């Protein structure tokens, strides 16, 4: 079964559009395509097409990326399944605006009902929403793991410093998986718990900015979402879901090192080719993220472009690696 793999173009920004620039973008969410002028002036020109399973062209919304992406991934990892989402893109593309989003200017609206809000504050939000007086209980836990140049570092615990690398160990009563020694759970206890966490891990980034090099740029943050449930029936049994969220912001796929981004398309790579070996060992963002590529999980990818003929190269380039990762295939199954 096909992992799933959308494209969104961002919007031309104040600098462009006192240019006037014109897009080399096209979207079509009827053909679910993507066209991309190469060459040619006006009245004649080269493009290259994809299609995809779904297209979101420059004036989309959050709330329209939200309902069509994200709604049913939530459904589904509430009925108990594994999910992951990855934003895929150069920097300045849209990677972050799409899975944090950011706050409407002048304090207009609350985080909850602000239209600019992304993926993690309105999946967050929703869950609260969705399990209100359903007969689930419900608890709700956060974490946020990123890598750095293949260290580990927590966002999420107010009492350590940015500094201090986590360790990374194979999970013994898994194949699958891994242990991350030390890496902060946070239950969110309910909706009013939600932007203050999301605060600090915002300042927790800022001091990690500041001591390593472009690091909003080249890290990969995994925010994880862990939603234990359990139904009692009219007979008073209980039944037990597990259901995992990861939301995955990327490094930039422009242009030292990134081991684990060069190791992402390797992985994908063999998967696509069907060749028996896949070195998800050689990074780990694939240890981590191993049953996202390929094994039980369900994914998504949210592939991000530019308008912008100045980044033609590099959006074809996208479009190309996501393109290819439509072959992946996944199993999902109840946990
Ligand atoms: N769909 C969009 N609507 C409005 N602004 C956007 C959109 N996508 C990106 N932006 C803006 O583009 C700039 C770069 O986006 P950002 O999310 O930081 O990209 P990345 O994480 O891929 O580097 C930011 O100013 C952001 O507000
Ligand atoms: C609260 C912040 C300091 C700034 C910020 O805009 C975000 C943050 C950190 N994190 C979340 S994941 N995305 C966004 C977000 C959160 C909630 C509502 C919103 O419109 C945007
Ligand atoms: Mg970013
Ligand atoms: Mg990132």
């Known amino acids: 079964k096909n992992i799933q793999v959308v494209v969104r173009c961002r919007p031309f920004n104040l600098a462009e559009r006192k240019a006037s620039a014109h897009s080399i973008v096209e979207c079509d969410p009827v053909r679910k395509e993507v066209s991309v002028r190469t060459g040619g002036l006006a009245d004649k020109s080269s493009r290259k097409t994809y299609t995809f399973d779904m297209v979101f062209g420059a004036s989309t919304k959050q709330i329209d990326v939200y309902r069509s992406v994200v709604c049913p991934i939530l459904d589904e990892v509430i009925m108990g399944y594994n999910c992951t989402i990855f934003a895929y893109g150069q920097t ?88 991350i020694k030390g890496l902060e759970e946070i239950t969110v206890h309910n909706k009013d718990e939600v932007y203050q966490i999301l605060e600090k891990g915002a300042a927790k980034r800022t001091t990690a900015a500041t001591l390593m090099n472009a690091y909003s740029s080249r890290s990969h943050s995994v925010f994880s979402v862990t939603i234990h449930m359990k139904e009692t029936t009219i007979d008073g049994e209980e039944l037990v879901k597990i259901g995992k969220l990861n939301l995955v912001d990327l490094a930039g796929s422009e242009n030292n090192i990134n081991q684990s981004l060069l190791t992402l398309g390797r992985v994908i790579t063999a998967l696509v080719e069907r060749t028996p070996h896949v070195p998800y060992r050689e990074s780990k963002l694939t240890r981590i993220l191993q049953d996202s590529l390929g094994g039980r999980t369900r994914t998504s990818i949210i592939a991000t472009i530019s308008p912008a003929s100045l980044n033609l190269e590099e959006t074809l380039s996208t479009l190309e690696y996501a393109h290819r990762a439509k072959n992946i295939l996944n199993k999902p199954e109840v946990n």
């Open 92 to 179: 300045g593309t849209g990677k972050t605006f799409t899975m944090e989003g950011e706050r409407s200017p002048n304090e207009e609206y609350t985080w909850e009902e602000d239209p600019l809000a992304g993926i993690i504050p309105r999946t967050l939000h929703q869950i609260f929403e969705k399990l209100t007086d359903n007969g689930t209980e419900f608890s709700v836990k956060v974490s946020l793991l990123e890598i750095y140049n293949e260290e580990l570092f927590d966002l999420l615990n107010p009492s350590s410093d940015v500094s201090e690398r986590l360790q990374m160990f194979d999970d013994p009563r898994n194949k699958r998986g891994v242990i």
